[PDB]
Design a protein around this nucleic acid. Sequence first.
RNA 1: UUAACGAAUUUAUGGAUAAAGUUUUAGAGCUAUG
DNA 2: CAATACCTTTTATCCATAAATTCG
DNA 3: TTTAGGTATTG
RNA 4: GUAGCAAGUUAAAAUAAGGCUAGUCCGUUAUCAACUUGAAAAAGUGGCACCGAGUCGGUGCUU
Length: 1326
Amino acid sequence: KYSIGLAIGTNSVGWAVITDEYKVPSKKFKVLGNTDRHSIKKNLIGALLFDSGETAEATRLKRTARRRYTRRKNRICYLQEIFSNEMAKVDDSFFHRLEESFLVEEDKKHERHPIFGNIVDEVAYHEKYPTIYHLRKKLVDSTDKADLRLIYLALAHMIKFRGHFLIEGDLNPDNSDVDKLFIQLVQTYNQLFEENPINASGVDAKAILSARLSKSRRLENLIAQLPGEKKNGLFGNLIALSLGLTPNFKSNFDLAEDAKLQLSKDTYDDDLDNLLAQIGDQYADLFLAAKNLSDAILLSDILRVNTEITKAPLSASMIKRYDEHHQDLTLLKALVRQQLPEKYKEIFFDQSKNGYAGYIDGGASQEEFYKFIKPILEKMDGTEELLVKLNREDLLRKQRTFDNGSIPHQIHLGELHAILRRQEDFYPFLKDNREKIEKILTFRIPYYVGPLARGNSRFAWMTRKSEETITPWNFEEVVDKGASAQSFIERMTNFDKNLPNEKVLPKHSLLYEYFTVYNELTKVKYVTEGMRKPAFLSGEQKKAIVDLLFKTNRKVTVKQLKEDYFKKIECFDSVEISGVEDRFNASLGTYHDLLKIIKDKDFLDNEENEDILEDIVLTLTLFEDREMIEERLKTYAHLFDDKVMKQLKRRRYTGWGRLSRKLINGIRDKQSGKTILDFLKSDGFANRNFMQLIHDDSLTFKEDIQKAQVSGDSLHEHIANLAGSPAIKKGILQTVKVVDELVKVMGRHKPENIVIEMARNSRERMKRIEEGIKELGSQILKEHPVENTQLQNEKLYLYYLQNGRDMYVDQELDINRLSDYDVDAIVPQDDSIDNKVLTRSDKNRGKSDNVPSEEVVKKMKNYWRQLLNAKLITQRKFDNLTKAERGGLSELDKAGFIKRQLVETRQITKHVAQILDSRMNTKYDENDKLIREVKVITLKSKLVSDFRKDFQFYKVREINNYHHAHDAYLNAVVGTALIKKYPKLESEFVYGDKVYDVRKMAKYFFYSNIMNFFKTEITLKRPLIETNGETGEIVWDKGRDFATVRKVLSMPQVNIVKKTEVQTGGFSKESILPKRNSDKLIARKKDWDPKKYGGFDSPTVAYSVLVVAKVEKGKSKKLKSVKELLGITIMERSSFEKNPIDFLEAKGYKEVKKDLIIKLPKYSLFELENGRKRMLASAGELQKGNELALPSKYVNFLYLASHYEKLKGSPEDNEQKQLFVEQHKHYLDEIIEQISEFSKRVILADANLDKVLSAYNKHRDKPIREQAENIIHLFTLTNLGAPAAFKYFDTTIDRKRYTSTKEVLDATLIHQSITGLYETRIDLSQ
RNA sequence: UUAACGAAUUUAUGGAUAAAGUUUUAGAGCUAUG
DNA sequence: CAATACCTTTTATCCATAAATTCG
DNA sequence: TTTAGGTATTG
RNA sequence: GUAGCAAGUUAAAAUAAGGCUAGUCCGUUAUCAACUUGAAAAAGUGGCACCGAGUCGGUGCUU
């Protein structure tokens, strides 16, 4: 006796209920709690607002740093351990001094100066080496024994900040000068090639090689500079090799197989000797020279400056930035003193101003500083060498900035290496541990390994060789690198859908190939002259054809089968094959690729080897790393020749299949003794298909399958497995929590129908006209020009693609009056450009039930082709225009018109259908087949979208929140109506497998527009009492039903519930705050009084708790009873939950009433006084309660008043829509009045409302379309939810925030259920 | 995922890295003047 | 108090898997 | 990428 | 304390409090009205028809 309609979105689930005759019911509901209200009537329509679902990504990123920090403090801890023994000899508490660098002198346990204890030597230090970068150069360059404390500072400073690992290989300090390296590259070629010696002459190798151009264009530009040699010639192959390019040297030496050499790819050191051996070892001296140049090129962009004087270019690059800053500061500081010495105090002394004082001491970015002084620079003289420095964006640069990190960790390691090498003679431990220390800088946990856990991390998957602690130096021995790399993918690879306990096999698995061949072979039937009836392929032939034709060639065409097997082996000269199509879709691709390498056809056939051949593909498909493949295959090396193994390691397989090994060959019928595969050959006269095998009740497969699956799962897992946005899953869970409650309301009765629906270029317009009049060559673009912001107007934009001529008439069209000209769809209702055309009269096409007629096509079949070749129309647009010559829109073509429009393509929505449908129909009849009690309809959203505009139910989002229920109601109406009149479409719209045939075009309707039967009158007749033709059921009464629908829309009571949510996540605002004497300053770490060190602020409040107890007041300390709202923060919450009372007493409460403590989540609901509602937004803040029921005449008005997208509809309807504006013109005063009583009743903001009231008074003479739209802003003041700022016309009206929660404490608390219908009300009295 | 194989983008989940920011302290501020 | 005004870490790089989506 | 709750200070 | 002037670019340390399972692990996602039952997962709990409509109001029968 009822039906449910849903409208699912990101932030709301909308829900309404419908009757046989389309009324929405009501019911008296019990009210729990101590309040005198014992009952309420509420309508069975509602919606559920909620905060969006938050993705894990934001969280996961925090995790990356969380590990990034606990691994970096470990790296420095690693250097310190190396020094600990040796350093204590030099400085007893050097490391201690650093640990406590952050403590204030009162809390410091040692000397205040870190690098050296004494005040004198530390000042000398910054005197000589102002930057660490200054020091790095000296530690690299000098030969003098430098203090061990400095060595540590430099080395630890490189290990703390490595730069990035985005390069693999090594770059050298020698390799910066490309020309110096280039000449060696030319030079070696000359010591080897006296028959064709080359001369570098005066080629500019520096400029040509290191350029932002293609790796290809630079190659050509170089050899062009040389006297003329081929890029295919050997020198170019070398030069290409330096360029990050892959060249082939086969052409020069004409080697039997191609051997290319790329410097990024792994296969280079190994590939060299396999190629190098044939030419001989003498050449190799050349190839290393080329590799060196590559390393020269690569860092040619990173370290652009001259680096000839030093082995530490990076620090040298910094030292230059420092001195330039010093130089240019004085010139800037001086030139301001010289000409403008009044602003200098603002510039260099005011921290807050974004001056240099702001740049250094204030919080001002180089982008903010550059901007602020650029005006000053150009008013004083000599400011060119400094202004060119500012446009260069290199002026008064800091050394540590945002653009670094383009630095590759290798150049740091270069300075590290130099420092170690320099000072190892002086310090023995440096020379012993040099390699041990360098690995600290170079080591990176390989991603496939994952976090190195000891079974106590969710994310980890790694495997360990020894249960001992992991360090960068013993990493290979302790960690099973390979078996981790497999576990790495195996945990992300899918499971078998039919048997979800077993792993999916590789897509190129040999067993997968056979199964995939035989499943196509079993359903092949052959008909011959000798035979009366077609017969399935029998057991021998499948096994014959496979041995004969599939092992011999990659793909098997139908002609090969009739010729090679049927005619040759069975001697049938002619035959017809029904089952297979033109060629066999399956192939034995792994067989032949494996057959070619190992070359033992006997080997691939011994079923004893199937275990061994599966393993090679699983290892080959799985693994990326060349070395690790070898480690797995070594066990196989004895079976194989040493040359056979070489090719095996190369072939890699990509992809994962669908089905398990156990499914195909493990599962066995208890009675037949046979597997899935064994039934795929030899299934008797009837050869059964794979689906058929699982779906045969005589076989144990349907019974065995069901055992694995049910062993199924709770709702979360079923919902969470859903693929798609993680917030739209929330609405799903909420939409399904809604349905389960509606059924409870209806006395635990299941409903007949359920309707679910879910909601989801400016310059493009200029370019499709720009180039389409360039190839047309017409002057209609020059004759009248237009702009890039205008073309979102349909009629203007259609003219320009049309070129000023109508496709239906062939004449020049006036630019000024497009209102009289109709926008015409090629196919009667599509509103996109692909199907939109603008002509003076839409009847010129002929019959508006017909395709644009043969009369206009013969006139204009040519003009629309000119537009196609100029991309002024799309192939779909042209093919629907010309379709008149393919007999027009065929019944079978017109069926494709409507059917494609109605069905929902979105995979998520479909899954929602299952979720609902399977949760409803638990009963099964005596047959195996399921009983379809509840019908789950998926409605497209557009249908209702047009229905409201078509039938005067206009939707305005921002006036109100009722439209969420409104769309649910209106999805419920159009849904049940479309299935009442069309049960042939049940299979198309309902998740139900009935079956629907395209053939009809039970005739039903001629008209290609599905949404016609609702219409009382239709633009060219329909009876106002509709009934299905076949059953006689009364489906739609245009007179009777439409009255209730507007009545339901214009209903003033709808249940709107905002889901209550404990707030989770970050403790507090992330920013660090400078020291204060506040008590809201949260400590950063325990030993740090925020008053001395600075701390956090602005804790988020996880939930509020209501505390009724006594507190001490005054020096008198008399105990007086207070009832107030305590904020439990996220940091607090864990501590709170263990012991509430001890925790409460710690915050200052005494004699707390434990029974009465109430935990108040965010968005919790309070009604006080005159029914005004407040939602508790914080322990200390409140939020707006109430939704304003603007009457339907205004909603319908304001949508038409706002004048949405000018007017889209038919022009004759539009005139009365325009007339509706003036007729109801006085409404504007009614709308503004509505708010005033509602403001005073609920909102309590008179301060603001008065500037509102006083603002509307002034703009009375401005047009309605301009005036009404700005009236729409005003509602945001009335909106349920938070106070936010709104602007009328030119005046911004700030928000009214409720910074007291006192009034709540004496109101009645409302606990509402998911629907909003069941409640428990609680009146609060101390 | 398609009546079947490939490719690509996007979103989701996960891993290994990087450079900034912020905070306290260390970089003896001097010279007239109470 | 209740207004009033101000505040809120960001921005890169690479690897893997999966659906869902639009092209072949 | 803007929300909407902490926070301190004023007339 | 004011007026002058010199100066500045760098560094160490922390980067959710913290937790025990002490790992070169983990600590911001999902999930949540209320009441009874539960360690939890979860299960359980709220008569109907009519007339009407400014955020649900009245009446009739059973209860």
